[PDB]
Amino acid sequence: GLVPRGSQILCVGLVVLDVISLVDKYPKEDSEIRCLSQRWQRGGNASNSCTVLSLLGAPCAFMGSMAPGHVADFLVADFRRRGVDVSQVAWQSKGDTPSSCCIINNSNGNRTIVLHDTSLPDVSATDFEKVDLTQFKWIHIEGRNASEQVKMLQRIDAHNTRQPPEQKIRVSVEVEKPREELFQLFGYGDVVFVSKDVAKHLGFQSAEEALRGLYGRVRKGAVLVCAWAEEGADALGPDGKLLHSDAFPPPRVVDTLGAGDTFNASVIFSLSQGRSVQEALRFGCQVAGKKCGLQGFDGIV
Amino acid sequence: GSQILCVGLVVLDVISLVDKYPKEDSEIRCLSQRWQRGGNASNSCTVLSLLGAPCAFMGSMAPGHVADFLVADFRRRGVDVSQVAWQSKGDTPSSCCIINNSNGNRTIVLHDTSLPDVSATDFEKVDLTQFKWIHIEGRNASEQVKMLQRIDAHNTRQPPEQKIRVSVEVEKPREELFQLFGYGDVVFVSKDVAKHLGFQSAEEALRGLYGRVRKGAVLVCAWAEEGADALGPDGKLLHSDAFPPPRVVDTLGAGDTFNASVIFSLSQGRSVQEALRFGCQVAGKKCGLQGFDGIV
Ligand SMILES: CSc1nn(-c2ccccc2)c2cc(NC(=O)C3CCNCC3)ccc12
Ligand SMILES: CSc1nn(-c2ccccc2)c2cc(NC(=O)C3CCNCC3)ccc12
């Protein structure tokens, strides 16, 4: 179908099928057991954020890798069930579409996770070259294969140079994995998200420390953002003013899977609507907080 | 009577292959992944099929995408599926299988839906005239004992050369199952059952349990890497050493492979001794491979 120019928010990242089983007690290797319940669930950061963008009322698209098969089929159908445009998927002739097994111990809350295989090629810079950008008002990139992703950002930068300011594509990036190669991604984007887990691995004990201690790594004029779960979230821009919003805890915490992606998507959304950074931190915290008290993404409205 | 019928479960196996089992609450990356049509009766058809024996599966499926996969795989193997007891109240079973590549160990997390078990009422609708052998995965006793009843009846009215051979698998240590022991010319009991029931070895289990079989029936007990044993009406104990591959990589469906190969052998007129041995040969060969393709 036809996508009006400059209307869509794109997220580039991982889609994965999570098979989530609820057990009484962790299984002894080599046993056989009945779970209490078992859910198949579309997962992955970029993928979760797409869902949140649609439910919020943004037109949005996912770009990641998949391979023909029954897993992709279920994933594509779950994407479409959430109104996500999947026409930018990078279909692959080699490799398994990512699938993960997660086992949630019902008598202690602990998650044991068999994570997907590494067989499937990441979206590459040459793949991104073939994409007509005029669709997108905002492009958000989940840091994975950094050396390639840098080329994509450089290509968006090149596109932008020629556009009137009112047709520039905003860019955001997320570094959520404590992996040296990713750290070069700070240098890109108007908005850079850093996870609590990355901050800590770099030795920072709080949002504020993380921001003050990493802002030097981001490009001129960029905003750097760090959610710290129940401690809410900070952002730091060019003006050096450390911004903050408290959390919005829900009556009781049901499900936190994807709360971080929900917050990313919500900030992006608010910013893309022309709200202030401070207004967007708040909204982010409000939406992610609400979601944490619901199963899945259903009632975040 | 050209075909073999198996009566049990078909289950979607979502398989992860890992090089060590994850410590509780840890997170490990798997070597690779695949989907497999599994379930006992389902695995046996795979095996009979591979061995060259026309066969048919009879179990409860629920229409959907899962079933479309299962059915397609069934057919890709040449398994007659026309006897499937379709439903509308429940999903088709599935499970996660973590397969330790270092010792082929397999760990199974089963999601059992509502999908009710095939019933005598479904079975009484079966043209027994196509079947040389009928094998029954022991599940709902009460309701299957009737299925057996039907077969015993049908046999009375037939030449001692046109009778239908019957095998029963008693997989679970459940008391309801203790009565299937019971019927059939060949009774398979697993190591787990035997153990979960007071016995320390195949030889013991066969002595312990023989008193419960139909006159002239063979009691069979596999015992993993120790091989397998059998006991007939003549009271001579039969053993077969295992055939371990040099590298065990995937034992998912070993037992079922053993059962199918014994059944195949017996249905070709081989002696019980030859059948025990062929059973271990194929099960062993399969434990050296991921999946089933390549046993023959
Ligand atoms: C800044 S927006 C945000 N709010 N909350 C939140 C606030 C109050 C009560 C409950 C949740 C979050 C929780 C997580 N994530 C988790 O808490 C996970 C729990 C398991 N360990 C990983 C973190 C991620 C983001 C948020
Ligand atoms: C009698 S035919 C047979 N051979 N093998 C075999 C022999 C040597 C190496 C590997 C396998 C089997 C293994 C199982 N079953 C298992 O190994 C199970 C694995 C999980 N723990 C329970 C036993 C069941 C039957 C057989």
Judging from the principal axes of the Cα atoms, what is the shape of chain A?
globular
Please, what is the CATH homologous superfamily of chain A?
A: Ribokinase
Separation, N- and C-terminal Cα atoms of chain A: 26 Å
Estimate the strand proportion of chain A: 15-25%
CATH-level-2 architecture of chain A? 3-Layer(aba) Sandwich
Question: Which SSEs are present, and which pair or pack?
Answer:
Two copies of one chain form a homodimer.
Chain A: E1 8-12, E2 16-23, E3 32-34, E4 37-43, H1 45-56, E5 60-63, E6 65-66, H2 70-81, E7 90-91, E8 99-105, E9 111-115, H3 125-129, E10 136-142, H4 146-161, E11 170-175, E12 191-194, H5 196-201, H6 207-214, E13 223-227, E14 233-236, E15 242-245, H7 259-272, H8 277-292
Parallel strand pairs in A: 1-5, 1-10, 2-8, 6-7, 10-11, 11-12, 12-13
Antiparallel strand pairs in A: 2-4, 8-9, 13-14, 14-15
The structure holds ligand TR3 (2 copies).
